[PDB]
From Swiss-Prot:
SUBUNIT field: Component of a hexameric 5S RNP precursor complex, composed of 5S RNA, RRS1, RPF2, RPL5, RPL11 and SYO1; this complex acts as a precursor for ribosome assembly.
Ranges in a coiled coil: none
Name assigned to this protein: Symportin 1
InterPro entries: ARM-like, ARM-type_fold, Nuclear_Import_Ribosome_Adapt
Keywords from the UniProt entry: Repeat
Renumbered ranges of ARM repeats: 159-192, 314-347
Organism: Chaetomium thermophilum (strain DSM 1495 / CBS 144.50 / IMI 039719)
Length: 556
């Protein structure tokens, strides 16, 4: 390729010689140059071919001049932001974490020294320190997110943690730096024991107390603090069933998060006069969604369940309200999506509990009427409105499935929701257990249980059986869910749908006939690559055999 040779000749080779040499404008200038050169795919790749990282790690970063070190860190930053995660793995294998640790060491020295105190430095100098800090914070987050192994290595770098704690507790860095430090620590504290411990055991800066005061009060950064504290509560297992210092758990954060949601209204979401308050709103929703997942452990292990209690009484009403706001922008659509996400997580967690035989009766009773309200106030209104967005259809269907799993035959029939989900099912196929197809099958089967009307049961039953008869374009995960739905609905000879549908419409012939196709398809699922699906398919194949013999034994 001759166009690459010239491109290499006229923008790559020159700037690299600039990156080199004794001085030193050229280095921040190199960097700034690369910040835009790096943006082009073809220019970025030539630079990597020209060994820029090796240069930066051996020369630019180890330079006595801070203007040079700053330029070096900027270059690694923009590269990491543009490449895939494997680039971060590469920096990691080159031992970039030791260099980051050394730079954070120097930053921390400069911020805490009285010789001279940081405030007494010339503004141009303080800015370079912020330049570098900014680059480091971004890099640390990207690296942690690239691989679990790198995340754990970062957690062992006590000096990185101390820099974060100091930036957060001293509360004297510029706004963007404080926010990036909060965001970085949020990333590092997610599912990480060592980080959680470092935060709660920090008696140099008492970062945990600083965070706790902020999360609980009226500072506009309350929600940011909440994000970090929730991550550590889950990591350390500070929960309802085993509270942390002074009873600490997710429940103590829910008020602040719910408070953030009442400020959202149809009309004003983000302003220039009010910038990125829009910022609190989505962070609150993201945190609420994470709590909705994480609190599963308390349910397994409502005076003793304050988090569940706060989710039902305080959070969910606002989530419902936000889920159904008039859309008048992209912000309102993003907000609706984030609200559905949190509702979904909360609702799925509760529906995974065993309720038959009067188990978890207290939770069931506390939730049931909220389940019905979500069905009526969120699900139905979205369903009416033939939105073509599959993302939104996927979310509403996922939530509906979660809710219908609790309601079953008591799910409202208002508006014939089953027909819309079946219709959604077919339309999706015209544009593994997380597929939209599976979700449609799940919700529709759930609402068909006795005491659903017989014709609701019949339309759903006939849909499910027709998947078995015409399974050419039906993936295994959908077959497995369809079979399981059928087992749940027609397993009882004393229910009206047994004689009035199962036997009358000849479902048995079609189930029995499916068996060979089921054997074939179950074997086709690779155990190495899809062990969870294969396991569920084998169980369904076994139950299909059992169900067929049972129905024959009880044939009318």
């Amino acid at each position: 390729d001759p166009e690459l040779a010239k491109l290499r000749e006229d923008k790559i080779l020159p700037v690299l010689k600039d990156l080199k040499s004794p001085d030193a404008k050229s280095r921040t200038t190199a960097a700034g140059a690369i910040a835009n050169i790096v943006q082009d795919a073809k220019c970025r790749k030539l630079l990597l071919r020209e060994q820029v990282v090796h240069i930066v790690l051996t020369e630019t970063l180890t330079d006595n001049n801070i203007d040079s070190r700053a330029a070096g860190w900027e270059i690694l930053k923009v590269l990491a932001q543009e490449e895939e995660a494997d680039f971060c793995v590469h920096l990691y294998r080159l031992d970039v974490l030791t260099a980051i640790e050394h730079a954070a060491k120097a930053v921390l020295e400069t911020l805490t020294t009285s010789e001279p105190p940081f405030s007494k430095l010339l503004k141009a100098q303080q800015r370079l320190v912020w330049d570098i800090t900014g680059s480091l914070l971004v890099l640390i987050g990207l690296l942690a997110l690239a691989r679990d192994e790198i995340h754990e290595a970062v957690a062992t770098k006590q000096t990185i943690l101390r820099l974060l704690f100091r930036l957060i507790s001293a509360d004297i860095a510029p706004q963007d730096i404080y926010e990036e430090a909060i965001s970085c620590l949020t990333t590092l504290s997610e599912d990480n024991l060592k980080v959680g411990q470092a935060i709660t055991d920090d008696q140099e800066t008492h970062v945990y107390d600083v965070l706790l005061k902020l999360a609980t009060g009226t500072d506009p950064r309350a929600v940011m603090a909440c994000g970090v504290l929730h991550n550590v509560f889950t990591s350390l297992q500070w929960m309802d069933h085993s509270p942390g210092k002074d009873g600490a758990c997710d429940a103590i954060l829910i008020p602040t998060l719910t408070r953030a949601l009442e400020h959202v209204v149809p009309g004003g979401a983000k302003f220039n006069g009010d910038a990125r308050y829009a910022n609190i709103t989505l962070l609150a929703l993201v945190t609420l969604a994470s709590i909705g997942t994480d609190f599963q452990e308390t349910l397994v292990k409502l005076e003793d369940l304050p988090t569940l209690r706060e989710l039902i009484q305080t959070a969910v009403p606002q989530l419902i309200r936000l889920s159904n706001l008039p859309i008048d922008s992209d912000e309102s659509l993003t907000i609706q999506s984030h609200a559905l996400s949190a509702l979904n997580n909360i609702s799925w967690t509760i529906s995974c509990l065993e309720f038959a035989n009067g188990e978890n009766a207290n939770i069931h009773n506390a939730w049931y009427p909220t389940a019905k309200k979500i069905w009526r106030k969120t699900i139905l209104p979205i369903l009416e409105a033939d939105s073509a967005d599959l993302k939104l259809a996927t979310q509403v269907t996922s939530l509906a499935w979660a809710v219908a799993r609790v309601l079953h035959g008591e799910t409202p029939t208002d508006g014939n929701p089953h027909r819309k989900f079946i219709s959604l099912y077919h339309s999706s196929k015209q544009q593994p257990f997380q597929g939209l197809g599976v979700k449609c099958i799940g919700v529709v089967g759930s609402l068909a249980h006795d005491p659903a009307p017989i014709e609701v049961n019949r339309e759903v039953g006939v849909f499910l059986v027709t998947l078995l008869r015409q399974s050419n374009n039906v993936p295994p995960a959908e077959i497995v869910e369809a079979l399981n739905q059928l087992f749940d609905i027609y397993g009882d000879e004393e229910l009206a749908c047994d004689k009035e549908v199962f036997w009358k419409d000849g479902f048995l012939k079609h189930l029995e006939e499916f068996l060979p196709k089921m054997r074939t398809l179950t074997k086709g699922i690779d155990k190495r690559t899809q062990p969870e699906l294969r396991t569920r398919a084998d169980e369904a194949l076994l139950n299909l055999g059992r169900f067929v013999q049972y129905k024959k034994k009880h044939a009318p």
